[PDB]
Amino acid sequence: ATVQQLEGRWRLVDSKGFDEYMKELGVGIALRKMGAMAKPDCIITCDGKNLTIKTESTLKTTQFSCTLGEKFEETTADGRKTQTVCNFTDGALVQHQEWDGKESTITRKLKDGKLVVECVMNNVTCTRIYEKVE
Numbered sequence: 001a002t003v004q005q006l007e008g009r010w011r012l013v014d015s016k017g018f019d020e021y022m023k024e025l026g027v028g029i030a031l032r033k034m035g036a037m038a039k040p041d042c043i044i045t046c047d048g049k050n051l052t053i054k055t056e057s058t059l060k061t062t063q064f065s066c067t068l069g070e071k072f073e074e075t076t077a078d079g080r081k082t083q084t085v086c087n088f089t090d091g092a093l094v095q096h097q098e099w100d101g102k103e104s105t106i107t108r109k110l111k112d113g114k115l116v117v118e119c120v121m122n123n124v125t126c127t128r129i130y131e132k133v134e
Contacts, residue, residue, distance in 0.1 A: 003068070003088040004046055006108060008043070009134075010043070011130055012040060012041070012129075015129075017125050018035055019036060020125075020126070025080075027078045041056045044108070044115075050066075051066055051086055052065040060077055072084055082098060082099040091109060092108060092109040103121070104119065106119045107119075114131055116129055
């Protein structure tokens with residue numbers, strides 16, 4: 001498996017655990033309502049070691065770019081400024097976020113043609129499944 005195989009526009013088809021993940025982060029109720037009904041597309045592009053991940057919906061539109069392996073400042077949707085690192089390892093894109101002594105990991109992998117995105121903080125997990133928009 002490779003990082004290039006994650007490229008494309010992806011539509012959200014299933015979500016489990018989103019609200020609980022947001023509660024673990026301590027995100028406030030307005031932003032958790034907004035997440036309970038937004039179904040953002042994810043657009044992943046990678047040019048060698050350059051990665052970009054964009055989220056698009058009417059409620060939520062965000063993007064970040066990085067170099068694989070290099071720490072960078074990510075501003076998250078909820079407004080954290082994290083030190084983030086993305087790496088492609090063991091067939092998955094792994095995005096590690098650290099802020100204020102806290103940590104969360106977001107993993108993105110292909111399973112049977114679908115993009116499976118797992119976010120975890122302190123054992124609290126959100127699993128999101130996407131299908132390719134083509």
